[PDB]
Amino acid sequence: LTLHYLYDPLCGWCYGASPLLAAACEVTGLDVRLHGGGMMTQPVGAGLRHMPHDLRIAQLTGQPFGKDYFDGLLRDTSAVFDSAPPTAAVLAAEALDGLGAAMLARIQRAHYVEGRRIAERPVLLELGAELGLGEGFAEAFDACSGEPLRAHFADSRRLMNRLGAAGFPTFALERRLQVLDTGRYLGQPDDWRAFLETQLRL
Numbered sequence: 001l002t003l004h005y006l007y008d009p010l011c012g013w014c015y016g017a018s019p020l021l022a023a024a025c026e027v028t029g030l031d032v033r034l035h036g037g038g039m040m041t042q043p044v045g046a047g048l049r050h051m052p053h054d055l056r057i058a059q060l061t062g063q064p065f066g067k068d069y070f071d072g073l074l075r076d077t078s079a080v081f082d083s084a085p086p087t088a089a090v091l092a093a094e095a096l097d098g099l100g101a102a103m104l105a106r107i108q109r110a111h112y113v114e115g116r117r118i119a120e121r122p123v124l125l126e127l128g129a130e131l132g133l134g135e136g137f138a139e140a141f142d143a144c145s146g147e148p149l150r151a152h153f154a155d156s157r158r159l160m161n162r163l164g165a166a167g168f169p170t171f172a173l174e175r176r177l178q179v180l181d182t183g184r185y186l187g188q189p190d191d192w193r194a195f196l197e198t199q200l201r202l
């Protein structure tokens with residue numbers, strides 16, 4: 001039984017679903033695969049900022065948003081919302097140490113809580129070194145940024161296409177593929193964990 005997670009690091013609703021990914025990774029016997037879809041492959045300014053989701057995500061999921069994000073990053077004209085570098089960091093963390101899910105959660109915290117520029121290589125290398133990957137992560141990240149990332153995006157978008165999935169977050173359970181009702185479980189990680197346990201029982 002495999003849980004496929006189609007995500008994008010710059011998708012606010014994926015951050016709202018971060019507790020669901022964390023809860024899923026605690027279910028014994030359940031395999032979890034990450035699929036980055038490449039949502040933004042935008043400079044920060046008038047167009048990118050026009051946020052009203054974010055406070056709604058916080059109301060629904062309890063996920064925190066930091067002042068350095070609201071009043072720092074989203075106000076920084078020279079920041080770029082690029083989904084490719086953070087996705088390559090997730091790929092590299094998974095390739096090096098099987099820490100893809102942990103790296104995605106850390107990336108989202110760096111962006112939404114800390115207001116860091118997750119599209120920049122030094123920030124992603126700093127996050128990898130925080131997770132204890134400083135030996136080899138730089139080379140793995142640069143390697144994953146090229147043709148591995150491109151192939152990963154193409155694979156993810158073909159999966160989205162076959163499932164009729166319009167966007168992120170999207171969870172699909174493979175036993176045969178079944179897309180799950182993620183909106184039902186937003187803000188309910190304990191319900192979500194029990195649902196995945198109940199699927200193993202059935």
Ligand SMILES: *SC[C@H](NC(=O)CC[C@H](N)C(=O)O)C(=O)NCC(=O)O
Pocket residue numbers: 010011012013014039166167168169183
């Ligand atoms: S965060 C990027 C967008 N995600 C959603 O709109 C999800 C909606 C919530 N899950 C919900 O309504 O409960 C997105 O993917 N938009 C379409 C796109 O492909 O850009």
